[PDB]
Design a protein around this ligand. Structure first.
Ligand SMILES: *Cc1c(COP(=O)(O)O)cnc(C)c1O
Ligand SMILES: *Cc1c(COP(=O)(O)O)cnc(C)c1O
Ligand SMILES: *Cc1c(COP(=O)(O)O)cnc(C)c1O
Ligand SMILES: *Cc1c(COP(=O)(O)O)cnc(C)c1O
Lengths: 397, 397, 397, 397
C-alpha cells in the first residue's frame, strides 16, 4: 500500500539517488521539493515543559537546513551521524579540540594539507600535544610509530598536494588492534571515489568547500562519525566553539551535492587525458595522477579508488623554479591561477608560494613539494581547451 | 604575448568551456573567480557629465550579475545578446508586448506550453491581436497560415507536453521569405541539444527555471535576440515592464548552467533507458521519446537534435483517466508528483489536471493530451530506482 | 485560556506591532521566529485528488515566503489582499494590463513617476488606450476631466519628483460617484504617513524598492486591493505575466518592513531640519517639503499626512543649470549622487538628466522639473553631516 | 577641491553616519551603493610575483564583504581593527585559544553568558588553564584576584542575565598597571550605549547575532582589537580555526547595523516604560533595569551608559519557580518564548531551564538567577501590546 511520497519498503536506494534525495523529503507543511532556508537565529517554544519538542532552540547548536545536509552527508559517507562546520579547518580543529589533551601523541601524514599541518604545529602543540609527521604510504610505518600516548592517527588520501595514498583499510586494522582513533581527510577523494568509514575509519573530515560544493561558491566542513558516542562529542564541542555551518551554506551544498557523481566523473575523465598528455610532454619532468600507469602507488589506487582516480593531478616542469614561474604566468583561460580545488573551473596552483609558503624549502623538498612543482585541479571544461592552454604555457616555459 | 587571466587571441572556447566560463571573467577589483552578487538597487555616478560612465544606474534597467548571465546565455545560444526575466512567462509576454499591436496576427503551435496558450487567449487577445493555433509538424501549415498582418510565428520544439518537433530551419526559411519574426521556445531542448538561432530563428525564449537551473531552485526567463535591433527593443520594454531577473537568481543560474551539459547527458541516458522499458510494458499503450524507433518524427529528431534526445518523455497508460490517476497516486520516491521539469529530481505529472486543465477535454484530446497521457521529466537519480518506481506505479494502474 | 504563541482575543495589535509581526507567526514545523525562505520552484502534491491541498503548486503562481509578505502588506495598507511583484513598474504595468482595454480613457497625474508616464505613453497607448495627463492638485480638475470612457484615475501623492499632493479622499469620493477605479501610487508617502485605501482608494501601488526596503537592497512592487474581486484579477494576471516577487526578495522586505516606522520617523525629522536649512540658504531659490510652513499645499499635507511629512524634499539652486551641476558635482559623502530614494543612505538626484531625461525641456518646465531642480532623498545619517555636505556643495555652486 | 563620492578631508563623520556608511564606499567598478556579496571561495592572481596584489586569495583567510563589515565595526567600536566570526562563541573561543596556554590564569565574571562559562569550565580547563569566576561589580575584586599567571581579565557589562555592570574604566586601569589583557563582552550594551575600547579595554567581543543583526536573521561574532599586534594574532588564529564569518552573513549585518541607533533608541524607550510598569505590579518581586531608580549600580550606569539604558531588563515574579513557569506558558503574542535577545521581536525567557540550566540550582541562586527570575529582550513593537501581554501573563502567575 505504497502511495506517492513514500519509498518502496525494503529497497536501499542506489548511490546516485542518495546524492539527489539523501536526507531530504518534500517540506511537510507546503510540499516544497527543496527544503526551505531557515535563515533564522532562534526557535519559539510551545511551553517551558515542551522545551525542544520541535527539535530546535538556537541555530549555533542546530539548524533545520544544516541538519538536512548532515543527514545526506552521513548517508553518502556511510556514517552514524555528520556535523557541518563553517570550514574544513573548523571541522579538523574540532577533531583535535575534542580527542586530544595535554600529554597526548598524534600521528599525522607528513604530506597533510598545509593548514592541518600548521594548526597542529603552530597552535595545538602549545597545549603539550605531540604531533609526529610520518610517511603514511607504508602502513607498518604507522604501526611502528604508535606510542603508548597515541590517541589519534590522522590520515589523508590522496594527500594535498603530492597525491600520496594511505592504505585506509590497513591503517584502520592497525588502529583497531592498538585502540587508537583513526581520522581520515578524504577531501581529495570525495565519497564517490573512497569512503574511509567503509574501510574501518572512526572519523572522516571533509572540506565541503572543494568537491561537495565544486562551484567555488561556499566554504564548508563536515565531520562524519562511525558511532553515536563520537558524533555526540563532536556535536557538543561544535556548539561550544560556535563554528557550525550557516543555513544558506547548507542550502548551496544540498544543491551542489546532487551533481557530485556526474561532476567527479567528468573532472576525472578530463584529469586522465590531461595526465596522459603531460606524461608525453618533452618539457614535463614528472606527472603524478593515481590513474596513469606510472603512478608509484598504482596497486593501492586500484584497490582503494572506486569509479575514478579524481580531478587532482600534479607535475614538475623541466628547468626548476624559473620554468615553473614562466609556465604559471603564461597559463591562459580557461585555466584560473589561484588557491583551492575540486571546482567546475580548472585551477592551477603553485603550492611553494600559495599553499605551503610557511614551510621551509629544505622541508618542502623533503616531503616532495619540489622546485617546479604544479598542483592541478581539473574542472568540467572541454579537455581540448585545457590541454591547448597547458601546451601553450609549457611552450612558453 | 599572452599572460595568465587572458583567453588566447583568435581562439573560440569549445561548447562545455562556454557553459563553465562564458560571459564571466574574474572580478577585476579582487580577482574573485565567481562574479560577486550585486544585491543592490542603485549605482552612484562620478558626476552629472559622467552619467552611466561605469555602465549602471538602476537594477530594474540593468544589473552587473544579470548582465554577466545574459552574456553567457547569448554565447551558449549563439545570439547577439540576451535579456533575463523573473520567469519564462515574463520573457514570453515581453515578446508579445514588444512585437504585437492591435490588428496584428500571431501563429502559435497548438501544442504550446499551457501558460503561453492562456496569456495569448485570455489576455493579449483583448488588444484585438489575432492568435491562430496550428500544427507546426508540417512547415507548409505555417507558410499557408501567414497573413499580411502576421508579425510573429511562435514555435516550440520539443512541444509541451506531447514532444512534437517543429522543423526550425524550414520554418525560419518561410519566415525570412515572408519577413515575419520566428520566435522559438526551445526550453525542452536546451541549447546543448538544439540552438534555434543556429537554424535561422530570429528570437529564442527560454524558461531558465527548467534546465538552465535544473535544481528546482529559481524561476527565470531569457530572450536571446539574433540582432542588435531586436535586442534593444526587448531591453527597452523589459525596463518598462519591470520584469528583469534579480541578481540573486542570476548568480544561482550562473552556477547551475556550468553543469547543464553533464546534467542533460545523464538525464537523456536515463530517459532513453526509461523509454525503452516503458515501450515493452504491457500496461503502457504508447511511449513518446525522440530516441526510440517508434517516434513519429525520428527523421527530423536525427537532423535537429545534437548529442542527446533530452530528459523529457511521455507515455499513455492503458485504461484511460482512472488508470492514469491510480498510477500517479502510487508513483513512489524518488519520483516527485508535481508541476515543472528539467531538474536533477525526476518529476511525473498528468497534464490533464495539472498544467493543461483550463483546456476543455474535447480540445486537449484534439491536440494530443489523451486520457491516460503522462509527462515525465527524467532527473539524474540511478535509472534502476526510477524504473522500479514506474514499474510499481504501473502495477496499480 | 490564552497560552504562549496566541494573541489576546478581541485585541487589534497596534501599528508598530503589525510592522514587526504582521502576516508572520513562528514556523509551525520548527518554531523558527522568522519564516523560512522557500527558495523553491515546484511543490509536491499528496495525490491527483488532493491537488493544492497544502496551498502551493508553482512559485510563479504563489510562494509561501511571498504570501507571508503579501499578508503583512495587506494588513499595513488596510486592504483585502496584496500581490507582490519583481518591481514597482511590474505592479503598475499589471494594473494597466488588467483594468484597461482598447477605447478606454485613463486620467494620470501629469507629475506621475517618469516610468509610469513613459509606460503609458510609449507602450499601453499603442493598444488604443487614451492616457490624459492632468493637474491632480485640484480634485475638480479630475471630476471635470472624467469622460464616459474613463475606467481608471491614477493618482500619486506625494508626486515624483515635484512633491505635489492629490486629495486622495476627495478624488476617491469623485471616483465612487462616477463609478471609476481609483489607483493611488503612495510610494513617496509609505503607509506610515498615508494609506490611500483608508481614504477610499480602490487600489494602492507601492514600489517596495524605496521605503518598504529602505536599504537600497532589493527591487519590489506591491498591489494592495480594497476588494476580493480586484485582488483575484491582479493575482490571475500576475501568474500569466510571470512578474511575481522572488522568495529571497520577500524575505529581505519582511525583515526591512519591521523598522519602517522608526526609519521614516528619523528620515522625516532629518528632512524637516534640512528643508528649514535650505529655506534659509542665500543660494537656494525654492525649497519644496510638505512639512515647512511655505509648502503651497500645506492644508492638504496637514489633513492627509499622519506622523511625518516624509524623507523626500526638493529645491532649486540660484544660477540655473550650471549652478545646479556645480553643486551636484561637489556634494560630498555621506551623500550619494544616484537614482532611487527612501533608503537609509541619503541620495541627491538631478531628475532632468537621471529620471526625466526622456521628457522634452518645454514639458519638464511645464510640470515643474525646472533648470536647477534637485530631488533629495533624506536617510538616517547624522543631520549635521548631511547639512555640512549640502552647505559645502552650495558654497561651491 | 573635493568632488562627489569623497568625504571632506579633515572631517570625522558623526555617530549615526558611521553606522550607515562606516567602512563602506560605492563599488569602484560599478558604483553599486552597497558593496556586492563575494559569494566566492578563491581569488585569481595576476601572476606568481603579484600574489595578493589585489589583497585576497582564499575566503577562509579574508573575504571583501567580511572585510567591509570589519572596517565598519572597528570604526563604530573605536578599535584599530576587527575580525568577524561565524558566531559570538567563535569570537570568544578565538580569544581563549590565542591568549591562554597551559599554566595561565583567566579571571571571568561569575555572571558571564552561560556558553562562555561552559567553553571555559568544560573545554579550555582540560589544557591546564585556570579559570576563576569572581564578582566584577567591585573592581578591587579583580585587582586582588590577579596572579603572575593571569593573561586575560574577561568582563561583561551589562552581564547576562542579571544585568550587573562592570566599571570598564577602573578594571582597564588595574589591567594596564598589572599588564593583563582586558577583554570586554559588551553584547548587551552595543557600541551605541558603551564602547569598552574608549574606556581602556584591550579587546571587545560582540555577539553580532544579538543587536548588530537585531532581526533574528544571522549568527555572528566580532573581535575588535585596540592595537595592530592584538589584531594580527586574532586574524592569524581565525585563519587556523576556520571560524570566519560568511560573505552572506556579513552583507546581512552590513545592512542591519545601519538602523542599530534608531532600533536601540526604540527598544530602550519601550524597556524604560516596561520596567516602570513591572516596578508597580503587585505580582512582581524585583525589577532590574539600569534606567529605574531601584537599580543597585545607578551611579556607574549614569557614568558608563551613553544615550540609553538598553533593551534588556529582568524581573523576579512572586511565588518562585511554579509562578515563573505559569507566567512563561501564558505570555501571549507579540512576545516570543525562546532563547536569544536584541531583536525587533520582543523575547522573554526563564534562564533557569533555557540558557543557564547546566549550572546547578545552588550556584545559579548564588550568582543571582533566582527561582522566578525572567530575562526580557524588548523589541520595537508598540509598548502597549508588550505591557498588555506581560499584564495578562502575570495574572496567571
Ligand atoms: C582545503 C582543505 C582543507 C581545509 O578546508 P577549508 O574549507 O579550506 O577550511 C583541509 N584538508 C584538505 C585536504 C583540503 O584540501
Ligand atoms: C515552464 C515553461 C514556460 C514558462 O516558464 P516559467 O519560468 O514557468 O514562467 C514556457 N515554456 C515552456 C516550454 C515551459 O516549459
Ligand atoms: C521608483 C518608483 C516607481 C517604480 O518602482 P520600481 O521598483 O523602480 O520599478 C513607481 N512609482 C514611484 C513613485 C517610484 O518612486
Ligand atoms: C549570545 C551571546 C554570546 C554568544 O554569541 P553567539 O552568537 O550566540 O555564539 C556571548 N555573549 C553574550 C553576552 C551573548 O548574549
Amino acid at each position: 500500500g505504497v502511495k506517492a511520497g513514500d519509498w518502496l519498503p525494503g529497497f536501499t536506494p542506489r548511490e546516485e539517488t542518495v546524492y539527489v534525495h539523501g536526507g531530504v523529503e518534500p517540506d511537510p507543511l507546503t510540499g516544497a521539493i527543496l527544503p526551505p532556508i531557515y535563515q533564522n537565529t532562534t526557535f519559539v517554544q510551545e511551553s517551558v515543559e515542551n522545551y525542544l519538542s520541535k527539535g530546535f532552540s538556537y541555530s549555533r547548536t542546530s539548524n533545520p537546513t544544516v541538519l538536512s545536509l548532515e543527514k545526506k552527508i552521513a548517508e553518502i559517507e556511510g556514517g552514524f551521524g555528520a556535523c557541518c562546520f563553517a570550514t574544513g579547518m573548523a571541522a579538523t580543529v574540532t577533531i583535535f579540540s575534542a580527542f586530544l589533551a595535554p600529554g597526548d601523541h598524534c600521528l599525522v601524514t607528513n604530506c597533510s594539507y598545509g593548514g592541518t599541518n600548521r594548526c597542529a604545529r603552530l597552535h595545538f602543540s602549545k597545549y603539550n600535544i605531540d604531533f609526529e609527521f610520518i610517511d603514511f604510504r607504508d602502513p607498518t610505518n604507522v604501526e611502528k610509530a604508535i606510542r603508548p600516548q597515541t590517541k589519534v592517527v590522522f590520515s589523508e588520501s590522496p594527500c594535498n598536494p603530492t597525491l600520496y595514498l594511505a592504505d585506509i583499510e590497513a591503517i584502520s586494522q592497525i588502529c583497531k588492534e592498538k585502540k587508537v582513533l583513526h581520522v581520515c581527510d578524504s577531501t581529495f577523494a570525495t565519497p564517490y571515489m573512497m569512503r574511509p568509514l567503509d574501510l574501518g575509519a572512526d572519523i572522516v573530515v571533509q572540506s565541503t568547500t572543494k568537491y561537495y560544493d565544486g562551484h567555488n561558491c561556499t566554504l564548508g566542513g563536515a565531520v562524519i562519525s562511525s558511532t553515536k558516542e563520537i558524533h555526540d562529542k563532536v556535536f557538543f564541542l561544535r556548539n561550544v566553539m560556535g563554528n557550525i555551518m550557516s543555513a544558506q551554506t547548507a542550502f548551496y551544498t544540498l544543491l551542489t551535492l546532487k551533481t557530485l557523481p556526474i561532476r567527479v566523473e567528468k573532472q576525472s575523465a578530463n584529469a586522465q587525458k590531461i595526465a596522459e598528455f603531460l606524461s608525453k610532454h618533452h618539457k614535463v619532468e614528472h606527472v603524478i595522477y593515481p590513474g596513469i600507469p606510472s603512478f608509484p602507488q598504482k596497486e593501492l589506487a586500484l584497490k582503494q579508488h572506486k569509479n575514478v582516480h579524481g580531478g587532482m593531478l600534479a607535475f614538475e616542469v623541466k628547468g626548476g623554479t624559473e620554468a615553473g614561474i614562466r609556465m604559471m604566468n603564461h597559463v591562459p583561460r580557461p585555466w584560473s591561477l589561484c588557491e583551492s580545488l575540486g571546482a567546475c573551473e580548472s585551477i592551477i596552483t603553485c603550492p611553494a608560494v600559495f599553499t605551503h609558503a610557511n614551510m621551509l624549502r629544505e622541508d618542502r623538498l623533503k616531503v616532495g613539494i619540489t622546485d617546479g612543482f604544479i598542483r592541478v585541479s581539473v574542472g568540467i571544461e572541454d579537455v581540448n581547451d585545457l590541454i591547448d592552454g597547458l601546451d601553450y604555457a609549457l611552450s612558453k616555459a
